[PDB]
Structure 1
């Protein structure tokens, strides 16, 4: 049974970058809904599978991917943020950044452009290519998870669904991306990097 993870900080810890109302809604409503729906879909899958009901299994895919994906991405998202975050990362991660993207700023530019570029709901990710052994930016529609659909390992994710910023920034998604860099938990990103560079 999948469960809703506690936020690692206070709902208002990311102020003024991401206000409290959003965080609380995002976590207690949006993410909680993914987990509940995921658990429901997964149980139906267990049944379809045991029955060899291929039709049901296939019918269940949209919900499995959307909700499962939602749980995956949001669980990562919370740890990617921190009230003590901001600035730039250090050591290897940074080294890989200035390398795979030129400079930190060129990296921020590229991730932001990828996030603002998403038409409709989606996510902008900083991932790691294990086959190529290097960093790589990608965008996923709706809740499709990075690894499950691209094979890339998620390091830093930026949710651009409107529920992630609309109450505070309205239609101006750019102001949102601008502000979020102030709360990036580079410690966690660094951690995720070193984890797949083993």
Structure 2
């Protein structure tokens, strides 16, 4: 069982950067749909599994990756934002940032470039590479979850699906990316980082 997580703010807490209408639809509609479909897919897989039905398992697994990934991605995203967010990180996170990307600006520039460049719906990720021990930027198609498909540990995600910005910024993703920086919860990103 999986559930739709309650936000730690209210829908309008991020205005004017991300309007309340987007936050409400994104949470109670889009994320809700992924959780519901995820639960369905996984009561189905559990019975395909019990019967040893390999064909059903494999047919199931675009559904499970899309909805399961949708749940994982959005669950992290909500925690990645805050009405008291914005600014720059401090401590080991900032030290690591300029160590792997040169500076906070270069990092910001590369993450923005990765998110805006996604063809179609997708996500832009700052991740941690456990093996190599360094920060890394990656982009995922649709709702493919970062860790499950790449191995990298997710620290910060920028959702570039049209439903995350279109009603407010239309076709101009650059404006969407430029605005979100003001509400990123660097306190949460650092927590994620330290746990690695």
TM-score between the two structures when normalised by the length of structure 1: 0.99
Question: What's 2:50 paired with?
Answer: 50
State the SS of the aligned residue for 1:49.
helix
Question: What's 1:73 paired with?
Answer: 73
Distance (Å, rounded) in 2 between the aligned partners of 1:20 and 1:35: 21
Question: What's 2:125 paired with?
Answer: 125
Deviations 1:135-175 (A, max 9, x none): 00000000000000000000000000000000000000110
How far off is 1:29 after superposition? 0.2
- After TM superposition, what 4+ stretches of structure 1 lie above 2 angstroms from structure 2? none
How far off is 1:8 after superposition? 1.1
How far off is 1:22 after superposition? 0.3
State the SS of the aligned residue for 1:57.
helix
For structure 1, which runs of at least 5 residues remain unmatched after alignment? none
Number of aligned residues: 196
Deviations 1:15-52 (A, max 9, x none): 00000000000000000000000000000000000010
State the SS of the aligned residue for 2:62.
helix
For structure 2, which runs of at least 5 residues remain unmatched after alignment? none
TM-score between the two structures when normalised by the length of structure 2: 1.00
Distance (Å, rounded) in 1 between the aligned partners of 2:165 and 2:66: 20
Distance (Å, rounded) in 2 between the aligned partners of 1:160 and 1:148: 19
Question: What's 1:21 paired with?
Answer: 21
RMSD between superposed Cα atoms in Å: 0.3
Distance (Å, rounded) in 1 between the aligned partners of 2:42 and 2:100: 38
Distance (Å, rounded) in 2 between the aligned partners of 1:53 and 1:164: 38
Distance (Å, rounded) in 2 between the aligned partners of 1:55 and 1:19: 44
